Ligand binder design. Structure first.
Ligand SMILES: CN1CN([C@@H]2O[C@H](COP(=O)(O)OP(=O)(O)OP(=O)(O)OC[C@H]3O[C@@H](n4cnc5c(=O)[nH]c(N)nc54)[C@H](O)[C@@H]3O)[C@@H](O)[C@H]2O)c2nc(N)[nH]c(=O)c21
Length: 100
């Protein structure tokens, strides 16, 4: 990093070790630390009442969390790149996402 290098002059993604997580509005930072305790130390960055980003120390841990979330029924997990690739959310259709 700021020590003297960024990996190269290329413009590839920088979030391959980061997840996006979706949950009921009653979930807390403590439930998130409990969910991701399987991967050691982490970092958490909110974006709504019902979703946040979560950083992990390896992309292998990201792949394991994305595989294991298929069995969850009180939360769900995807990569940062999946969240970006689904940004066209289309949440409601009564008039449009501009109105709900
Ligand atoms: C602790 N939180 C926070 N949030 C959601 O994340 C948003 C950003 O929070 P934060 O990073 O702490 O930044 P701020 O210092 O800017 O926070 P702010 O002064 O707005 O005060 C906190 C807000 O978050 C709400 N909040 C706290 N605890 C809960 C909770 O259990 N559920 C919900 N749904 N909201 C909570 C407060 O009422 C206040 O408005 C933040 O704006 C919010 O969207 C959050 N979301 C969940 N589900 N759980 C949490 O533990 C938190």
């Amino acid at each position: 990093g700021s020590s003297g290098s960024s990996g190269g002059p290329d413009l590839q993604p920088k979030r391959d070790h980061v997840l996006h997580v979706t949950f009921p509005k009653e979930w807390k930072t403590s439930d998130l630390y409990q969910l991701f305790s399987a991967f050691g130390n982490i970092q958490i960055s909110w974006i709504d009442d019902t979703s946040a980003f979560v950083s992990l120390s390896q992309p292998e841990q990201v792949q394991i969390a994305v595989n294991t979330s298929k069995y969850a029924e009180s939360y769900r997990i995807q990569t940062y790149a999946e969240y970006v690739g689904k940004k066209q959310k289309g949440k409601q259709v009564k008039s449009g996402p501009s109105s709900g």
